[PDB]
Amino acid sequence: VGYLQPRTFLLKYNENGTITDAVDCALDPLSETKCTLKSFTVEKGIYQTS
Amino acid sequence: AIPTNFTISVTTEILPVSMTKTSVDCTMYICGDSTECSNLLLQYGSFCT
Numbered sequence: 116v117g118y119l120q121p122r123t124f125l126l127k128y129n130e131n132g133t134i135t136d137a138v139d140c141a142l143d144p145l146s147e148t149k150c151t152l153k154s155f156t157v158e159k160g161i162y163q164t165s
Numbered sequence: 166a167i168p169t170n171f172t173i174s175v176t177t178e179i180l181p182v183s184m185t186k187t188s189v190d191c192t193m194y195i196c197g198d199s200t201e202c203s204n205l206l207l208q209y210g211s212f213c214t
Contacts, residue, residue, distance in 0.1 A: 163188060
């Protein structure tokens with residue numbers, strides 16, 4: 116049993132119209148940067164967050 | 166006219182190079198500590214980006 120919480124989730128849709136990947140935008144600074152840049156594979160470099 | 170004597174002078178020129186790097190947070194400058202303001206600004210996220 117789990118309690119759902121209102122968290123921002125980034126979804127990745129494929130060609131079948133179904134959700135195949137979900138990223139929790141509120142969990143880590145790297146996840147926040149991925150949600151802000153709308154990407155899933157960030158390279159090397161510094162980034163500014165909130 | 167043919168120059169005979171000579172003098173030595175030093176010319177100083179002032180030229181800027183660069184300035185200071187600044188960062189302006191869109192959320193902290195528009196809303197800050199609010200929920201409805203952030204929900205309304207989410208529609209204008211492209212501008213802040």
